[PDB]
Structures are given as structure tokens and as C-alpha cells.
Amino acid sequence: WXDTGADXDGXEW
Numbered sequence: 001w002x003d004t005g006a007d008x009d010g011x012e013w
């Protein structure tokens with residue numbers, strides 16, 4: 001996906 005913590009459309013990672 002891409003993210004890490006706060007924020008997104010599900011989290012975590």
C-alpha cells in the first residue's frame with residue numbers, strides 16, 4: 001500500500 005501510522009483507509013503498518 002504505502003502508509004505507516006496515522007492516516008489512511010484502514011491502517012496500521
Ligand SMILES: *C(=O)CCCCCCCCC
Binds near residue numbers: 001002
Ligand atoms: C503496497 O504498496 C504493497 C504492494 C507493493 C507495491 C506495488 C507497487 C507497484 C509495483 C511495481
